[PDB]
Structure formats: C-alpha cells, structure tokens
Amino acid sequence: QEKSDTNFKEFAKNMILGFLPVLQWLPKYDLKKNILGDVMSGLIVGILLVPQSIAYSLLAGQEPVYGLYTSFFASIIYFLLGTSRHISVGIFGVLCLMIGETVDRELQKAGYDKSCYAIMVGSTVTFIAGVYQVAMGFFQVGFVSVYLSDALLSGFVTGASFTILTSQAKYLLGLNLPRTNGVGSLITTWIHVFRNIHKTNLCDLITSLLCLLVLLPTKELNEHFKSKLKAPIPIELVVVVAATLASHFGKLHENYNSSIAGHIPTGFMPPKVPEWNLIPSVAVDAIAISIIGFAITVSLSEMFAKKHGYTVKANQEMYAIGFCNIIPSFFHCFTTSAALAKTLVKESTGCHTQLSGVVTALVLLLVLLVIAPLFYSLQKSVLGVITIVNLRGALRKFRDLPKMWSISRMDTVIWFVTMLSSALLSTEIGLLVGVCFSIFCVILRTQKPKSSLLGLVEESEVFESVSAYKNLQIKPGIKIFRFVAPLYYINKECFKSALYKQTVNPILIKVAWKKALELHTIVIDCSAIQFLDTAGIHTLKEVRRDYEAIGIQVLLAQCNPTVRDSLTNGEYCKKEEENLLFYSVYEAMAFAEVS
Amino acid sequence: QEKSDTNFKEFAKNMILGFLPVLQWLPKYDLKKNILGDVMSGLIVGILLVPQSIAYSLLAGQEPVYGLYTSFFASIIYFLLGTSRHISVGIFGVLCLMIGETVDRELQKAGYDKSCYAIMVGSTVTFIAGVYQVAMGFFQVGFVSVYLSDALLSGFVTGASFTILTSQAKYLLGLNLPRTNGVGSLITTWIHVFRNIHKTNLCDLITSLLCLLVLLPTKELNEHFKSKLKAPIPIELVVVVAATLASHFGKLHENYNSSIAGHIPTGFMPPKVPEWNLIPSVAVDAIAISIIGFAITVSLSEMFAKKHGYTVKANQEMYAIGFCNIIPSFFHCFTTSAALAKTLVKESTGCHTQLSGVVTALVLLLVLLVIAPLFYSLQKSVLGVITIVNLRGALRKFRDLPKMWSISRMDTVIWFVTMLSSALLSTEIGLLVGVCFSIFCVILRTQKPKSSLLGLVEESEVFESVSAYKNLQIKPGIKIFRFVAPLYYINKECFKSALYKQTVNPILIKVAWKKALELHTIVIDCSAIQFLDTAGIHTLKEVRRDYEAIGIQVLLAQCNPTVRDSLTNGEYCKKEEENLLFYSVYEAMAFAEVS
C-alpha cells in the first residue's frame, strides 16, 4: 500500500617551509612578550632536566655521560625540525628500559671493553630505529599508530613502571646481582634479592631512607600547593647537591663500601660510525621501540596542539623523531621520544614558543663542559630514589580506572590485562598481548549481540525495542525482529537461534506437522546490520526458505545501500521480479496488514 | 515540538539415551525398506574404501597394514556412539599429511626399528588428540569451531591438496629423496626432484602413465554420467587388481627395479599401550589436528542432518570423534575424521540408516584376514596415481571462487591468501595465517566506513542517503549526517575527518574568526552506531564542545538503548537536565525547524 519508491543513482618553497620549520617563526618573534616566559621556562626545565638524564642513562647500563649527549642532541635537533610548540623531546624511561634489556642481552651473549661495547649496540639500534622511522615517514603510511588505543598505553606504562621499580632495587641496597633478564624478569629478580638479602649495607640503606624521607613529602606538597609557590620548587637538585657534598667532605667510600659513579670524562669525543655488522641481529627491537616512540610523540603533540590554537601535521612530526635517532646516532647516543612530566612543567610556566628547547640544550652545555670534576663520589643510591620517587603518575593511575569500571566495563579488562602482562612477562610481549587482545575484544563484542521484538510507539512512526521499554502496542502476529550486529560468520548461529527462540521454530513445527496458527508475517528490521559476508546471505536465504514452508512470509525492512547491493548482486537471493524489500519498517507493517 | 516520550523499563536414562545411541533405533528397524539399500550402500563404499585406506596409510610413512586397523576401528566405533546418519568417519587425507609430517619430524630427530617407531608417535599423538577432544567435550565449550569460516576451510583443503600432489612425486618416478620437511617444503621438494631428475626408471613411468590414462577419463565420465549407470562404477579396484596381476605373473621386480611393499602380516596383533614419555614433546600437534577434525566433522554432520529431516546434537557428536581417537589409539592406529567423497557416494545410493558403517567395517574383516598373501608385488606407483587422480574436487574449486569474486570481493582474498600460505609454508602455519587474517579483515572492514548526508523522501518520514539516491529534498542548512560503523578507537579519526569534510570545519573557522553563515543545526543520525568505547564518548563530546563555539548546535538522533545507557552513565556527556537526544530523526528535524 502506497509503496514509496525512490530512484537509484547512476555512476618547491612550500616543501622547504614544511621540512625546516625554523624559517617560519624566527623572522617575526614579536619580542614584547615572547622572550621572558620562554627563557625562564627553559632554565626551569633545564634545572629539572640535569638530574633526570644521569639517572636514566645509569638505568640503561652505561655511564652517566652518554645520556647528556642524548638529551643535548635531542633538544638541539628538534628546534630545526619540529613543528609542534610544547613537547620537549627528552628521555622516556620505558625506552631506557628497552634499551637496557637489549644491550644487556647482547652484551651477555656476544661479549662473554664493557663501557665501550655498551655504546655500540645502543647507537646501532637507535640508528636503525631512526631508519625505520624515516622509512615509515617516506612511505607516508602512519596507519599503524591508530591500532594502539589509549586504554592500552596507559596500562603498558604502568607495567613498565613496575619493572623500573623492581630493577632499581639493587641500587637501593647496594648488592651484586647477576643479569636475571628474560621472561620472568620481575619474579626472578625479586627472589634473587630475597634469597641474597643478608648482605645489604648500612650505608646504602641509611642514605636511601633519609633521602626518600626528604623527597616524598616535599613532592607530595609540591603536587597541589602551586598557588603561593608559582614555579615548581626544585628539591631534586637540592637533595642531589646536598648528597654529593656529604659523600666528599665526609669520606663515604673508604669508611664504608657504597657504590660510586665512574669518573666522568671531559666530553665531546670525536664521532664514530655505528657497527654495521650488528644490524641483522638487532632489527627486531627497532620495531619494538620505534612504534611506541612514534605513537606517544604524535599523541602528545596533538593533545597540546589544539589546546593553544594552532595546527600541526603528521608527515613532518614523523621526520623530526626520525632524524632525532639518526644524527645523534653517530655521536654515542640512544633513542629519544616525547616528554610527559617535562612538557607539563614546561607549559605550566611561560613557554610562548619553541626556543625554550634551545635553552634546554644550552644549560646542558655548561653541565657537559665544566662540571666534569664534580659529580664524583655521589652514591648510586641517590639516583635510585630519584628515579623511584619520580613515578607518581604511573602509580596514581591505580586510583582512577579500577573506579572507572562504570564507563566502559571492557576497557578496564584490557587495561588490567595489559598491565599484568607487561609487569610479569616483558615489555615487548606485554605490548603485543595488549594489542592482540584489544583487537580480539571487538569481535568478542560482535559475538553474542542483542535482539528484541519492536512494537509501535503510540501515534507516530517510530519503533523502539520492547525488551527495554514500557507499554507499546504490538499487533497480534506481525512480530518484528531487530538484530544489532554485522551478521557475517561468527554470529550466524546466534542470529538463527535468537530468531527461532523469539518467534516460532520452523523445523520443529515442520516435523510435528509431518508426523500428523498465528504469526503470519515476520518483519526482520535489518537497519543495524552494516555489512554481510557470504554466510550472511546464505543464512538470510535459509530463513526465508524455511519460513516459507510452514506458511508465513519474511520481508526485510530498511537495509543500507551496500546490503541492498550485496543481496541482489549476491547469489540471487531475493530479487528478480518481486517486491520483498522495503524502505521503512512502518511501510512493511502497512503492507503486511493488507495481507 | 510534540516530543514523543516513552518510558524506560525497570529491572538418568535420558543420559544413556544420549551417550549410547545404538539403543534408540535398533529395537524398531522397520525392515520393509531399511535393509537392502543400506546393505548395498555398505558393500559399495566398502569396495571403494579398500583401495583408499592402503594409499592413505602409505602416505603417512607407515606400512599399508595399520590403516586397515584405523578404518576398521573407526567404522565400528561410530556405530556405538554417533548420533548422525550419513557421515561415515573414515580417513581424511589432510590428517594423513599432518601425521606424516609429525612422525617424520620425530623419527628424524630422536631416532637417528623404523616400522615400529613409526607407530608409537602416531598412536601417542592420536591418543592425546582424543584426550583433548574429550576434554573439550566435557567442558561443553565448542566455541572454538565457530572462528573457522567456510571460505577458510575451502582454501586450506586446496593448499594441503597441492602439498599432497607434490609429496606424491617420488612414487610417480621411483626415486630416493631425503626428508625435505619444514617451512619451504613444496619448493625444496620440487627443486630436489628437478636437480635429481636424471635417475628415473622406465618401469615407474610407463605403468604410471598407463594407469593414469585408464583412470582419469573413466573418472571424468563417471562424474556426470550417473543416469544410465546408477551405481558409481568401481574402476579403482579394477585397475588395482589389473596392476597386481601383471607385476606377479610378469616378474616386475627382478627384471626391473620398481618399488614393492611386501611383508603385510595377517593382522590383529596383541594391543600395546602408547608411549607416555613422548607426550610433552608432541602436544602442539594434537591442537593442530583435533580442531580441524572436530570442525570438519560437525559441519559435515549438520549439513546432512537437516537435509533428511532429523536432529543432531553437539555435546555427543564431539564425544564420538573423541573416543574414535582413544580406543583405537591402544590398537596401533592414527587419527580419523569425517568423509567428503565417501559420504556423498554413500548417501547417493541406498543409505537408510547407520548400519551401513558396520558393513563398512565388516567387508574390511575379510580384507584383514584372508587377503594377506595377496597384495604383494604391487607397485608403489599405482597407489601414487590412485591418491593423485582422487583430487578432483579440491582442484575443481579453482573454477568457481575466482569467478565468484562478485558476491563477496573480500572472501576471495581470504581464500586465496589461505591457499597460498598453506601450499607454500605448511599446514599448521597456513591455518593460523588464515584464521588470524580472517579475524583481522573484519576490523579492516570497520575502518574506513561509509558516510553521507541524508535528506527527506518526499511526503513520508523516511531518510535515505543522498550519495547513492536521486532527487530528495534537503533543507538549506539542517544538514544531517549518518555513520555506519561502531566508532570505538580505530575510526575516531575517520569520523572526525568525515564530519569536518561534509559539513563545515570548526577549528579553521574559529581561527579565521579570531584573526578578525548558514547551517545552524547538525543532526547526527547515530542509528547504525551499535556500541561505543571510551574514546567514542570522548569524540562525541568533542564534536559538541567544538561546534557549540561557532554558534551551531548538535543533537543525536536515534541511538540504541545501550548507546543511550553509555552516554548518560558515561562520563557525564550530554544529559543532566537537557533534552539533546531524540527518538526519531524526523522529530529532530521538526524540533530544529522551530529554532
């Protein structure tokens, strides 16, 4: 009755401006209020970046000298390539952990100097990771970073933070543990500590607890008392200078036996080519670090790009972190990526342009040239509690998402499985388990979908489900049915079983008829079925061929253009010279009422 | 205007009859027309099952005696447990290939008798595969067999058929090749043949070509001339008896040097316990064979169950193939599963009940007891062309699905990738690549979805897309928008970019406004968005917070009950004391027209 029929439809300086973005803000600086907040931000984050680089470089197994070349070349190389404004690419601790695992595995395998073979592997893997980044940037692909969610990175970071807390337990007591690195790394290292426990010092426990007692309440105050104290108070450099000038005026290496940092050379040695022969044995870890560095840096650039009102790209933001692993790779460095704490404390004070990074470079220079005879005779336990107490965020995350179970109910499971599988197993296998599980969970969400009868809406033409709404009039039998899943091959059985349960069953009624009623029309509302496979059109043909036997008819309701393509172009299913497919479900009710 | 508001809704003999199904058809046989077609079918498939069992048992590396125990115990054990009627569980050639690979790998590793150590590994892996089957049946799980599609098995079968055709090239020429088994098995075996080619016989090529010349046109006639010749004509036993009674009356082992499988003892040796110490090194191949045997047997039972008008179960069909690998596992056998050719030639003639299988057992008994001195002095090349020319179906499949590219366009890619990755690499890695690729392809289908404006339908209340339909009236600006994907985290960027491209862009217009119009309502039709993640409600909040800045408003249209749950229960997004969510999109047009 009044079948509404529509009609189908028939069938080069612009590059230099991109690549070298120092030449698009430097000729107009607008120095009225562009300098002072920027310079103060640069000195503040430089003061708060001195004690972090030595600690992170000590975490990777090397001496705390090469981390200064790492952070310095990283801060000076982003000023010439980066298109963001508030990122400050420095050192990310999870990258230091992965680099430490790789250089420890290769030094344990192929070695048996130590201090110079701990640089060849790191520089080579950072060089080839940058080669991978510039190849992924020259192909302009970037499609891999969208498969990493944001309830997956926030579990991987917490798992790697547990691994950092475990691997900084030797320096908190001053023991000599073997290289226990592999698949059960946290459990084996903790049982190695608790077996070999009755050998700890009385010098590497008193200064550790005293420095923790100074650090942790002061950071707890500094986190939420920023009103009367505008700049963040640098207690880290204060306790480092106070600990160095006790263990050198007080002779804390002969009277006791605490660990003491190397010697620290002048700096800026002649550059060296990385070892080409170690390339094919290490190019499974460049994949491991390049993807996560690229993902974290593009997410943390775009999150701060639209907050201040400008635009950033993605074919150039890849190249800056690409060459950040290329040109410093010829200068005894390791991998770098974006910041989390440093960029927030950078943007919180001043920070009107990119030139802060240059000052972030520049104050390192003094540190790298005239502070070589100092920073001797400081403990390796002060740096341990420095890189321990600076883990407030990745363990503050436990307070929120196990109480934000109410929003998602299925991202909490992904987050907790990724955290558990990255603290216990490793960092690479943990990230792989997280990615594959978050991919599998959407097809688990497709399987077992919802279904219900529909019914009317009392004097309009809307149809909403009767399993979750109050009194709606239903016709005696023109029973409607609605499926909210794609219906491809995983859930052909769920669709068949749900349709046979809500309405009557065809085969049982056919058997009891042959051994020797109401509901004379079923209207499948296929508005939500948003593609369909080969088995999809097979089971939609099967329900019609079964239901036509008893004496009832089946007619679909408001399919998409592509489903209506794949039905007629599909096998032959339901259209040669018949109507049997409608445009609105209320029209199907009006037709089936005419009988 | 007249906001249609509904109201939300507040919140033991029955087991023996299953397990032992010989006791539910045997007391009433109805012998008027239940015997004769059944018995003739049993003798016909027994005659056509004698030459196949020796060939398949020779494919697995063992003597052609243990295959007779395999098929006999398989046919006699399903009569006591099986609930189907037309399956006839015999020997599946891909199972013989996987068993051959496993016993060849273990015999090459741990060995260096050969004929008795080629039974311990096969019997042990079939025993533990049956243990896996009865464990998967006692847990009543069965959810794994739905992840295997039907455009995936039909590529895996063709890839394993290429591997059978390659691995039966030694016996087609009579050479001595080493065990070239691994990851590049087909390529290495073909290059080993074509390097070592100038050593073939003149006896193992003349009888091979002569027997192929007899077999292949006769099977080509027998495939589509079944009218005047009702029963399938058994030319296989005819050419086997004609080839045996040439190479024993004609002395074809002294005058030439062709291969001949002698020995062949009477049979029914005392039973032996399988080797328990080889359990933990082989339980990665029981997973490989149990899943595919269970999948093929449940699919081929249900495909023939509803064709004749009865019902079958799934908690009992698992147990029959479970114990088919348990009780014959103590009697020097290997794995069995359902039939494809044998069940079609069984059901095509006679076949009124299950008792055909007993005759399928019974005619083996004569073969296993008094045909021991015969079946000596037959070539190993006749059995080669027997198991070659019986591959008509799995290579006839190349004519259909590369011309059924028009139905699916994405199952052809899955099928071809599975065939290519199972012919070249292996059978296990090929099946794994097929399963993981078919899982990944549905989330590739979610990514890059369709979008369009809607427009009216000219004097009704339907809305269909304007990118694929002819003239529909559109309001000047109340531009509608429709998304047909779940919108979780993979395609937040596609949704944001498509909405910013079809309608106006918020951020660019805000920038040009701040440097110093039409479309005063966007109605997102979210009828097809069938769940949403945390990032989903984040980007749906972000589009409202952006669009509210310029001076236009955004209101969603006809979400599901679960999306309307996850919006309000979600963060706070859009409902405390506001309307901002409708029930039908035409009502949203009527509201936005009032302005």
Side-chain angles (χ1 to χ4, degrees), chain A residues 163-219:
Chain A
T163 303
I164 274 176
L165 165 63
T166 293
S167 158
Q168 289 279 333
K170 328 163 302 193
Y171 307 140
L172 273 182
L173 314 173
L175 323 173
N176 317 71
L177 273 303
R179 317 294 159 92
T180 79
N181 307 71
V183 171
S185 174
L186 191 145
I187 287 300
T188 61
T189 313
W190 267 111
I191 209 64
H192 262 285
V193 165
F194 267 121
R195 166 174 307 154
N196 206 344
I197 185 63
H198 56 278
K199 285 184 191 184
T200 174
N201 309 100
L202 291 199
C203 172
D204 266 359
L205 195 80
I206 297 302
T207 57
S208 159
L209 283 187
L210 187 42
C211 179
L212 188 134
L213 190 135
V214 167
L215 261 174
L216 179 62
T218 295
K219 197 75 63 175

Coordinates of all heavy atoms in Angstrom, one line a residue, chain A residues 163-219:
Chain A
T163 N 58.3 -2.6 36.4 CA 59.6 -3.2 36.1 C 60.7 -2.3 36.4 O 61.8 -2.7 36.9 CB 59.6 -3.6 34.6 OG1 58.6 -4.5 34.3 CG2 60.9 -4.3 34.3
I164 N 60.5 -0.9 36.3 CA 61.6 0.0 36.7 C 61.7 0.0 38.2 O 62.9 -0.1 38.7 CB 61.2 1.4 36.3 CG1 61.7 1.7 34.8 CG2 61.7 2.5 37.2 CD1 61.3 3.0 34.3
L165 N 60.6 -0.1 39.0 CA 60.7 -0.2 40.5 C 61.4 -1.5 40.9 O 62.1 -1.4 41.9 CB 59.3 -0.1 41.0 CG 59.0 -0.5 42.5 CD1 59.8 0.4 43.5 CD2 57.6 -0.5 42.8
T166 N 61.2 -2.6 40.2 CA 61.9 -3.8 40.6 C 63.4 -3.7 40.2 O 64.3 -4.0 41.0 CB 61.3 -5.0 39.9 OG1 60.0 -5.2 40.5 CG2 62.1 -6.2 40.1
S167 N 63.7 -3.2 39.0 CA 65.1 -3.1 38.6 C 65.9 -2.0 39.2 O 67.0 -1.9 38.9 CB 65.2 -3.0 37.0 OG 66.4 -2.4 36.7
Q168 N 65.3 -1.2 40.0 CA 66.1 -0.2 40.9 C 66.1 -0.7 42.3 O 66.1 0.2 43.2 CB 65.5 1.2 40.7 CG 65.8 1.8 39.4 CD 67.2 2.3 39.3 OE1 67.7 2.7 40.3 NE2 67.7 2.4 38.1
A169 N 66.1 -2.0 42.6 CA 66.3 -2.5 43.9 C 67.7 -2.9 44.3 O 68.0 -3.0 45.5 CB 65.3 -3.7 44.1
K170 N 68.5 -3.1 43.3 CA 69.9 -3.3 43.6 C 70.6 -2.1 44.2 O 71.3 -2.1 45.2 CB 70.7 -3.8 42.3 CG 69.9 -4.6 41.4 CD 70.5 -4.6 40.0 CE 70.7 -3.2 39.5 NZ 71.1 -3.2 38.0
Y171 N 70.3 -1.0 43.5 CA 71.0 0.3 44.0 C 70.3 0.8 45.2 O 71.0 1.7 45.9 CB 70.9 1.3 42.9 CG 71.4 0.9 41.5 CD1 70.7 1.2 40.4 CD2 72.5 0.1 41.4 CE1 71.2 0.8 39.1 CE2 73.0 -0.4 40.2 CZ 72.3 0.0 39.1 OH 72.8 -0.4 37.9
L172 N 69.2 0.4 45.6 CA 68.6 0.8 46.9 C 69.1 0.1 48.1 O 68.9 0.5 49.2 CB 67.1 0.5 46.8 CG 66.2 1.7 46.3 CD1 64.7 1.3 46.4 CD2 66.4 2.9 47.0
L173 N 69.9 -1.0 47.8 CA 70.5 -1.7 48.9 C 72.0 -1.9 48.7 O 72.7 -2.2 49.6 CB 69.9 -3.1 49.1 CG 68.4 -3.2 49.1 CD1 67.9 -4.6 49.2 CD2 67.9 -2.4 50.3
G174 N 72.5 -1.8 47.5 CA 73.9 -2.0 47.2 C 74.3 -3.4 47.2 O 75.1 -3.8 48.1
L175 N 73.8 -4.2 46.3 CA 74.1 -5.6 46.2 C 74.7 -5.9 44.8 O 74.9 -5.0 44.0 CB 72.9 -6.5 46.4 CG 71.9 -6.1 47.5 CD1 70.7 -7.0 47.4 CD2 72.5 -6.1 48.8
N176 N 75.1 -7.1 44.6 CA 75.7 -7.6 43.3 C 74.8 -8.7 42.8 O 75.0 -9.9 43.1 CB 77.1 -8.0 43.5 CG 77.9 -7.1 44.4 OD1 77.6 -7.0 45.6 ND2 78.8 -6.3 43.8
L177 N 73.9 -8.4 41.9 CA 73.1 -9.4 41.4 C 73.5 -9.8 40.0 O 74.0 -8.9 39.3 CB 71.6 -9.0 41.3 CG 70.7 -9.2 42.6 CD1 70.7 -10.6 42.9 CD2 71.1 -8.3 43.8
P178 N 73.3 -11.0 39.6 CA 73.6 -11.4 38.2 C 72.5 -10.8 37.2 O 71.5 -10.3 37.6 CB 73.6 -12.9 38.2 CG 72.7 -13.2 39.4 CD 73.0 -12.2 40.4
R179 N 72.8 -10.9 35.9 CA 71.9 -10.5 34.9 C 70.7 -11.5 34.8 O 70.8 -12.5 34.1 CB 72.6 -10.4 33.6 CG 73.9 -9.7 33.6 CD 73.9 -8.3 34.0 NE 75.2 -7.8 34.5 CZ 76.1 -7.2 33.8 NH1 75.9 -7.0 32.5 NH2 77.2 -6.8 34.4
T180 N 69.7 -11.2 35.5 CA 68.5 -12.0 35.5 C 67.4 -11.3 34.6 O 66.5 -10.6 35.1 CB 67.9 -12.3 36.9 OG1 67.2 -11.1 37.3 CG2 69.0 -12.5 37.9
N181 N 67.6 -11.5 33.3 CA 66.8 -10.8 32.3 C 66.2 -11.9 31.4 O 66.9 -12.7 30.8 CB 67.6 -9.8 31.5 CG 68.3 -8.8 32.5 OD1 69.3 -9.2 33.1 ND2 67.9 -7.6 32.5
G182 N 64.9 -11.8 31.1 CA 64.2 -12.7 30.3 C 62.7 -12.6 30.4 O 62.1 -11.5 30.3
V183 N 62.0 -13.8 30.6 CA 60.6 -13.9 30.5 C 59.9 -13.7 31.9 O 58.8 -13.2 32.0 CB 60.2 -15.2 29.8 CG1 58.7 -15.5 29.9 CG2 60.6 -15.1 28.4
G184 N 60.6 -14.1 33.0 CA 60.0 -14.0 34.3 C 60.8 -13.0 35.1 O 61.0 -13.2 36.3
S185 N 61.2 -11.8 34.5 CA 62.3 -11.0 35.0 C 62.0 -10.4 36.4 O 62.9 -10.4 37.2 CB 62.5 -9.9 34.0 OG 63.5 -9.0 34.6
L186 N 60.7 -10.0 36.6 CA 60.4 -9.4 37.9 C 60.4 -10.4 39.0 O 61.0 -10.1 40.1 CB 59.1 -8.6 37.8 CG 58.6 -7.7 38.9 CD1 57.9 -6.6 38.3 CD2 57.7 -8.4 39.9
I187 N 59.8 -11.5 38.8 CA 59.8 -12.6 39.8 C 61.1 -13.1 40.1 O 61.5 -13.3 41.3 CB 58.8 -13.7 39.4 CG1 57.4 -13.1 39.4 CG2 58.9 -14.9 40.2 CD1 57.0 -12.7 40.8
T188 N 62.0 -13.4 39.1 CA 63.3 -13.9 39.4 C 64.2 -12.9 40.0 O 65.0 -13.2 40.9 CB 64.0 -14.3 38.0 OG1 64.0 -13.2 37.2 CG2 63.2 -15.5 37.4
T189 N 64.0 -11.6 39.7 CA 64.9 -10.6 40.3 C 64.5 -10.4 41.8 O 65.3 -10.2 42.7 CB 64.8 -9.3 39.6 OG1 65.0 -9.5 38.2 CG2 65.9 -8.4 40.0
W190 N 63.2 -10.5 42.1 CA 62.8 -10.3 43.5 C 63.1 -11.5 44.3 O 63.5 -11.4 45.5 CB 61.3 -10.1 43.6 CG 60.9 -8.6 43.6 CD1 60.3 -7.9 42.7 CD2 61.3 -7.7 44.7 NE1 60.2 -6.6 43.0 CE2 60.8 -6.5 44.3 CE3 61.9 -7.8 45.9 CZ2 60.9 -5.3 45.1 CZ3 62.0 -6.7 46.7 CH2 61.6 -5.5 46.3
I191 N 63.1 -12.7 43.7 CA 63.5 -13.9 44.5 C 65.0 -14.0 44.6 O 65.5 -14.5 45.6 CB 62.9 -15.2 43.9 CG1 62.7 -16.2 45.1 CG2 63.7 -15.8 42.8 CD1 61.8 -15.7 46.1
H192 N 65.8 -13.4 43.7 CA 67.2 -13.3 43.8 C 67.6 -12.3 44.9 O 68.6 -12.5 45.6 CB 67.8 -12.8 42.5 CG 68.4 -14.0 41.7 ND1 69.5 -14.6 42.0 CD2 67.9 -14.6 40.6 CE1 69.8 -15.6 41.1 NE2 68.8 -15.5 40.2
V193 N 66.8 -11.2 45.0 CA 67.1 -10.3 46.1 C 66.7 -10.9 47.5 O 67.5 -10.9 48.4 CB 66.3 -9.0 45.9 CG1 66.3 -8.1 47.2 CG2 66.9 -8.2 44.8
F194 N 65.6 -11.5 47.6 CA 65.1 -12.1 48.9 C 65.9 -13.4 49.2 O 65.8 -13.8 50.4 CB 63.6 -12.3 48.9 CG 62.9 -11.1 49.4 CD1 61.9 -10.5 48.6 CD2 63.1 -10.7 50.7 CE1 61.2 -9.4 49.1 CE2 62.4 -9.6 51.2 CZ 61.5 -9.0 50.4
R195 N 66.5 -14.0 48.3 CA 67.5 -15.1 48.7 C 68.8 -14.5 49.2 O 69.3 -14.8 50.2 CB 67.7 -16.0 47.5 CG 68.9 -17.0 47.7 CD 68.9 -18.0 46.6 NE 67.7 -18.7 46.5 CZ 67.3 -19.2 45.3 NH1 68.0 -19.2 44.3 NH2 66.1 -19.9 45.3
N196 N 69.3 -13.6 48.4 CA 70.6 -12.9 48.7 C 70.4 -11.6 49.5 O 70.9 -10.6 49.1 CB 71.4 -12.6 47.4 CG 72.8 -12.6 47.6 OD1 73.3 -12.4 48.7 ND2 73.6 -12.7 46.5
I197 N 69.6 -11.7 50.5 CA 69.2 -10.5 51.3 C 70.2 -10.1 52.4 O 70.4 -9.0 52.7 CB 67.8 -10.6 51.7 CG1 67.3 -9.3 52.4 CG2 67.6 -11.8 52.6 CD1 67.3 -8.1 51.4
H198 N 70.8 -11.1 53.0 CA 71.6 -10.9 54.2 C 73.0 -10.4 53.9 O 74.0 -10.8 54.5 CB 71.7 -12.2 55.1 CG 72.2 -13.3 54.3 ND1 71.4 -14.1 53.5 CD2 73.4 -13.9 54.3 CE1 72.1 -15.1 53.0 NE2 73.4 -15.0 53.5
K199 N 73.1 -9.4 53.0 CA 74.4 -8.9 52.6 C 74.3 -7.4 52.3 O 75.2 -6.8 51.8 CB 74.9 -9.5 51.3 CG 75.5 -10.9 51.5 CD 76.1 -11.5 50.3 CE 76.4 -12.9 50.4 NZ 77.1 -13.4 49.1
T200 N 73.2 -6.7 52.7 CA 73.0 -5.3 52.4 C 73.9 -4.5 53.3 O 74.4 -4.9 54.3 CB 71.5 -4.9 52.7 OG1 71.4 -3.5 52.5 CG2 71.1 -5.3 54.1
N201 N 74.0 -3.2 52.9 CA 74.9 -2.4 53.6 C 74.2 -1.7 54.7 O 73.0 -1.8 54.9 CB 75.5 -1.3 52.7 CG 76.2 -2.0 51.4 OD1 75.6 -2.0 50.4 ND2 77.4 -2.5 51.6
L202 N 74.9 -0.9 55.6 CA 74.4 0.0 56.5 C 74.6 1.5 56.0 O 74.3 2.4 56.7 CB 74.9 -0.2 57.9 CG 74.4 -1.4 58.6 CD1 74.6 -1.2 60.1 CD2 73.0 -1.7 58.3
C203 N 75.3 1.6 54.8 CA 75.5 2.9 54.2 C 74.5 3.1 53.1 O 74.0 4.2 52.9 CB 76.9 3.1 53.7 SG 77.2 4.5 52.7
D204 N 74.2 2.0 52.3 CA 73.3 2.1 51.2 C 71.8 1.9 51.7 O 71.0 1.5 50.8 CB 73.6 1.2 50.1 CG 74.5 1.8 49.1 OD1 74.7 3.1 49.2 OD2 74.9 1.2 48.1
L205 N 71.5 2.0 53.0 CA 70.2 1.9 53.5 C 69.8 3.2 54.3 O 68.7 3.6 54.3 CB 69.9 0.7 54.3 CG 68.4 0.4 54.6 CD1 67.8 -0.3 53.4 CD2 68.3 -0.5 55.8
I206 N 70.8 3.8 55.0 CA 70.5 4.9 55.7 C 70.3 6.2 54.8 O 69.4 6.9 55.0 CB 71.6 5.2 56.8 CG1 71.6 4.0 57.8 CG2 71.4 6.4 57.6 CD1 70.3 3.8 58.4
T207 N 71.2 6.3 53.9 CA 71.1 7.5 53.0 C 69.9 7.3 52.0 O 69.3 8.3 51.7 CB 72.3 7.7 52.2 OG1 72.7 6.6 51.4 CG2 73.5 8.1 53.1
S208 N 69.5 6.1 51.7 CA 68.3 5.8 50.9 C 67.1 6.2 51.6 O 66.2 6.9 51.1 CB 68.3 4.4 50.4 OG 66.9 4.1 50.1
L209 N 66.9 5.8 52.9 CA 65.7 6.1 53.6 C 65.7 7.6 54.0 O 64.6 8.2 54.0 CB 65.6 5.3 54.9 CG 65.1 3.9 54.6 CD1 64.9 3.2 55.9 CD2 63.9 3.9 53.7
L210 N 66.9 8.2 54.3 CA 66.9 9.6 54.6 C 66.5 10.5 53.4 O 65.8 11.4 53.5 CB 68.3 10.0 55.1 CG 68.5 11.4 55.7 CD1 67.3 11.9 56.5 CD2 69.7 11.4 56.5
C211 N 67.0 10.1 52.2 CA 66.7 10.9 51.0 C 65.3 10.6 50.6 O 64.7 11.6 50.0 CB 67.7 10.6 49.9 SG 67.5 11.5 48.4
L212 N 64.7 9.5 50.8 CA 63.3 9.2 50.5 C 62.5 10.1 51.4 O 61.4 10.6 51.0 CB 63.0 7.8 50.6 CG 61.6 7.3 50.1 CD1 61.7 6.1 49.2 CD2 60.7 7.0 51.3
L213 N 62.9 10.1 52.7 CA 62.1 10.9 53.7 C 62.2 12.4 53.4 O 61.2 13.1 53.7 CB 62.7 10.6 55.1 CG 61.9 11.2 56.3 CD1 61.9 10.1 57.4 CD2 62.6 12.4 56.9
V214 N 63.2 12.9 52.8 CA 63.2 14.3 52.3 C 62.4 14.4 51.1 O 61.6 15.4 50.9 CB 64.6 14.8 52.2 CG1 64.7 16.1 51.4 CG2 65.3 15.0 53.5
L215 N 62.5 13.5 50.1 CA 61.9 13.7 48.8 C 60.4 13.6 48.8 O 59.7 14.5 48.3 CB 62.6 12.8 47.8 CG 63.7 13.4 47.0 CD1 64.3 12.3 46.1 CD2 63.1 14.4 46.1
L216 N 59.9 12.5 49.3 CA 58.5 12.1 49.1 C 57.5 13.1 49.7 O 56.5 13.4 49.0 CB 58.3 10.7 49.5 CG 56.8 10.1 49.3 CD1 56.5 10.1 47.9 CD2 56.8 8.7 49.9
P217 N 57.6 13.5 50.9 CA 56.6 14.6 51.4 C 56.8 15.9 50.7 O 55.8 16.6 50.5 CB 56.9 14.7 52.9 CG 57.5 13.4 53.2 CD 58.4 13.1 52.1
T218 N 58.0 16.2 50.2 CA 58.1 17.5 49.5 C 57.5 17.5 48.1 O 56.8 18.4 47.7 CB 59.6 17.9 49.4 OG1 60.1 18.1 50.8 CG2 59.8 19.2 48.7
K219 N 57.6 16.3 47.4 CA 56.9 16.2 46.2 C 55.4 16.1 46.4 O 54.6 16.6 45.6 CB 57.4 15.0 45.4 CG 57.0 14.9 44.0 CD 57.9 15.9 43.2 CE 59.3 15.5 43.2 NZ 60.2 16.4 42.4

